[PDB]
C-alpha cells in the first residue's frame, strides 16, 4: 500500500509500505529519499506520536494515510 508523508515545508512524499512494516523502517525509508536522520524524525498521526518500536497496524494506519513529520532540536 502507498502512504503520503507531509513535511512542514508542504512537501508530500509517497512511500510504498505494508501494514506489517515498522515505524522505524518507515523513517529509514524517508532517510533514503530525503536523507533526514530518523533520530530527528518524529512521526505524528492525527496528533498522536508514533513510537519507533511499533507497526502501522498498531495505530490502524491504512493506505493513503497522512503521516505528519515533526522535527526536534534540543540545544538547551
Amino acid at each position: 500500500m502507498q502512504i503520503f508523508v507531509k513535511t512542514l515545508t508542504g512537501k508530500t512524499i509517497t512511500l510504498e509500505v505494508e501494514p506489517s512494516d515498522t515505524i522505524e523502517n518507515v523513517k529509514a525509508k524517508i532517510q533514503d529519499k530525503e536523507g533526514i536522520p530518523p533520530d530527528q524524525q518524529r512521526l505524528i498521526f492525527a496528533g498522536k506520536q508514533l513510537e519507533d518500536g511499533r507497526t502501522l497496524s498498531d495505530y490502524n494506519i491504512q493506505k493513503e494515510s497522512t503521516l505528519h513529520l515533526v522535527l526536534r532540536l534540543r540545544g538547551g
Binding site: K6, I44, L71, R72, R74
Partner: protein, 52 residues
C-alpha cells in the same frame, strides 16, 4: 502582515488537530521555526486543551 505567520501556523494546525491556533501563532513569533515550534508542543511548552 502576519501572512507568513498564518501560513506556517496553519501547516502545524494540520499536523496537530488538537492544538490551540492562537498558541501556535504565539510560538511562531518567538522561535519562528516550525522545526522548533512543533517540537516545543510535543515537549510540553504549549498548554493542552485541559478543562478548568
Amino acid at each position: 502582515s502576519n501572512s507568513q505567520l498564518n501560513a506556517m501556523a496553519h501547516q502545524i494546525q494540520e499536523m496537530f488537530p488538537q492544538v490551540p491556533y492562537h498558541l501556535v501563532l504565539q510560538d511562531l513569533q518567538l522561535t519562528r521555526s516550525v522545526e522548533i515550534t512543533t517540537d516545543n508542543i510535543l515537549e510540553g511548552r504549549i498548554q493542552v486543551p485541559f478543562p478548568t
